[PDB]
Design an enzyme around this catalytic site. Structure first.
Site, mmCIF file in Angstrom:
data_model
loop_
_atom_site.group_PDB
_atom_site.id
_atom_site.type_symbol
_atom_site.label_atom_id
_atom_site.label_comp_id
_atom_site.label_asym_id
_atom_site.label_seq_id
_atom_site.Cartn_x
_atom_site.Cartn_y
_atom_site.Cartn_z
ATOM 1 N N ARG A 89 21.892 52.374 14.051
ATOM 2 C CA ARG A 89 22.510 51.435 14.978
ATOM 3 C C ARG A 89 23.817 51.025 14.305
ATOM 4 N NH1 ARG A 89 20.526 45.449 17.258
ATOM 5 N NH2 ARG A 89 22.577 44.959 18.160
ATOM 6 N N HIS A 90 24.932 51.169 15.013
ATOM 7 C CA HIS A 90 26.229 50.823 14.447
ATOM 8 C C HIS A 90 26.297 49.385 13.942
ATOM 9 C CE1 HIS A 90 27.331 48.332 17.871
ATOM 10 N NE2 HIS A 90 26.941 49.299 18.682
ATOM 11 N N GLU A 127 25.880 53.915 24.335
ATOM 12 C CA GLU A 127 25.022 52.839 24.790
ATOM 13 C C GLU A 127 25.013 52.972 26.312
ATOM 14 O OE1 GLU A 127 23.287 49.673 23.297
ATOM 15 O OE2 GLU A 127 22.590 50.733 25.094
#
Length: 171
Positions: free
Chosen positions: A7-8, A74
């Site tokens: 997850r960034h 996303e």
């Protein structure tokens, strides 16, 4: 297939609690710091990444040169992009909480989002590291029967499509 999903790192909208989809926000100072910490913590495998800035930058700072794929983006919140979770209509809050029946105006439905994500994962022929988003990690974890919420800049390894292997969060 062993797949590592990352997850960034955080952006300003994480602390603000706004729906962050295709709005191309940059990482915050802390977000970049989170990405750097991932370097040396992730396996040396072929890498793929969402083409959105925050994901690409996380991959870079993590020490990778990923091939970009919009399929790893996303979900597109459409008119709900930037909406504060707090003020979200109950129907939308519920749809996102239960992860079903969500189709924002001008956006992408959750069912279309899942199809996009899973079709991409199906095409992977060998172990890889995927720099992506909270909703993508969530879709994957939920499909494997687990709570899909993970911290920004954290990772999860899974044996797709059978089970979760490990969740890795750094301080």
């Amino acid at each position: 297939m062993e797949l590592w999903l990352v997850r960034h790192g955080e952006t300003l909208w994480n602390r603000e609690g706004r729906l962050l989809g295709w709005t191309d926000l940059p990482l915050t100072a802390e977000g970049e710091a989170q990405a750097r910490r991932l370097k040396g913590a992730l396996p040396s495998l072929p890498a793929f990444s969402s083409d959105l800035l925050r994901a690409r930058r996380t991959a870079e700072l993590a020490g990778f040169s990923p091939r970009l794929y919009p399929e790893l983006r996303e979900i597109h919140f459409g008119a709900l992009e930037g909406a504060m979770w707090e003020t979200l209509d109950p129907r939308y809050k519920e749809a996102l909480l239960r992860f079903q029946g969500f189709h924002p105006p001008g956006g992408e439905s959750l069912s279309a989002f899942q199809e996009r994500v899973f079709r991409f994962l199906e095409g992977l022929k060998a172990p890889a590291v995927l720099f992506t988003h909270g909703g993508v990690v969530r879709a994957v974890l939920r499909a494997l029967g687990e709570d899909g919420l993970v911290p920004p800049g954290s990772a999860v390894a899974v044996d797709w499509p059978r089970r979760v292997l490990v969740r890795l969060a750094l301080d």
